[PDB]
Amino acid sequence: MAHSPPGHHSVTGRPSVNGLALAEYVIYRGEQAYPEYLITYQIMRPE
Amino acid sequence: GTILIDLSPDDKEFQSVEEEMQSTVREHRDGGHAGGIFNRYNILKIQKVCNKKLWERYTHRRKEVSEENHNHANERMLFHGSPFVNAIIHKGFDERHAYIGGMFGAGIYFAENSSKSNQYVYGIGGGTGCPVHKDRSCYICHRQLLFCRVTLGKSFLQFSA
Ligand SMILES: Nc1ccccc1-c1nc2ccccc2c(=O)[nH]1
Ligand SMILES: [Zn+2]
């Protein structure tokens, strides 16, 4: 993996075009996330 | 040392996780190419992932970050979709789970929109879709996402399209 930007622990990808999109985030150390919940699902076909 | 505990649909913990999953679906600029065409999910199961060694690894790093950031871990709950979900829950996140070609460099990517992480369940850009039908919009096959506790610390803000 790459390193975080100097003096930072992650990157936040802010949306600048799509008004409805929420943020995305990047960490560069696996120890900075814990997989709390495992969700099993199907996507549903729109009616 | 991972065990998975099923949550009952009557449990408020099940209900709050399902609500975050459903309420953060959006439309995608690809028209559904990567993740499929849908407005909501059928939640089949929610399991708590319990691993003491991996939890302690997380909290150790979280303390390091907090102490570098005026006692503020800047901890979030975020979605992660990946073909390596089985490896992650047993062995933890590491460099093998990074997105090498990601727009913010080679790191591990998480989303506030569950539907964004849904685009990565079958690989980058949805890969070739589900293993059984080769369909990125498969309505039959069971998918899995992780809802993860993530330490952001001081986060570099990138404005981007
Ligand atoms: N791109 C990836 C490659 C391997 C494993 C996971 C992903 C992945 N990338 C994302 C990029 C942006 C927002 C969310 C994600 C994600 O959940 N997984
Ligand atoms: Zn399928």
Author numbering:
A (entry chain H): 1115 to 1161
B (entry chain A): 952 to 1112
Provide text from the study.
Two homologous tankyrases, TNKS1/ARTD5/PARP5a and TNKS2/ARTD6/PARP5b, catalyze a post-translational modification, poly-ADP-ribosylation, of target proteins. Tankyrases are enzymes (EC 2.4.2.30), which belong to a family of proteins known as human Diphtheria toxin-like ADP-ribosyltransferases. Tankyrases control β-catenin phosphorylation through regulation of the stability of destruction complex by ADP-ribosylating Axin and therefore inhibition of tankyrases offers an attractive strategy for treating cancers with increased Wnt-signaling. Tankyrase inhibitors interact with the NAD+ binding groove of the catalytic domain and they bind either to the nicotinamide subsite, the adenosine subsite or span across both sites.
In order to improve the compound we first studied the effect of the addition of hydrogen bond donors and acceptors to the ortho- and meta-positions of the phenyl ring (C-ring), which could form additional interactions with the protein. We hypothesized that the nitrogen would not be close enough to form interactions and therefore we tested amine (13 and 14), hydroxyl (15 and 16) and methoxy groups (17 and 18) in both positions, which could act as hydrogen bond donor, donor as well as an acceptor, and an acceptor, respectively. All the substitutions were tolerated except methoxy in ortho-position, which likely causes a conformational change in the compound not compatible with the binding site. Crystal structures revealed that the amine in ortho-position (14) forms a dipole-dipole interaction with the side chain of Tyr1050, which however does not seem provide additional overall binding energy.
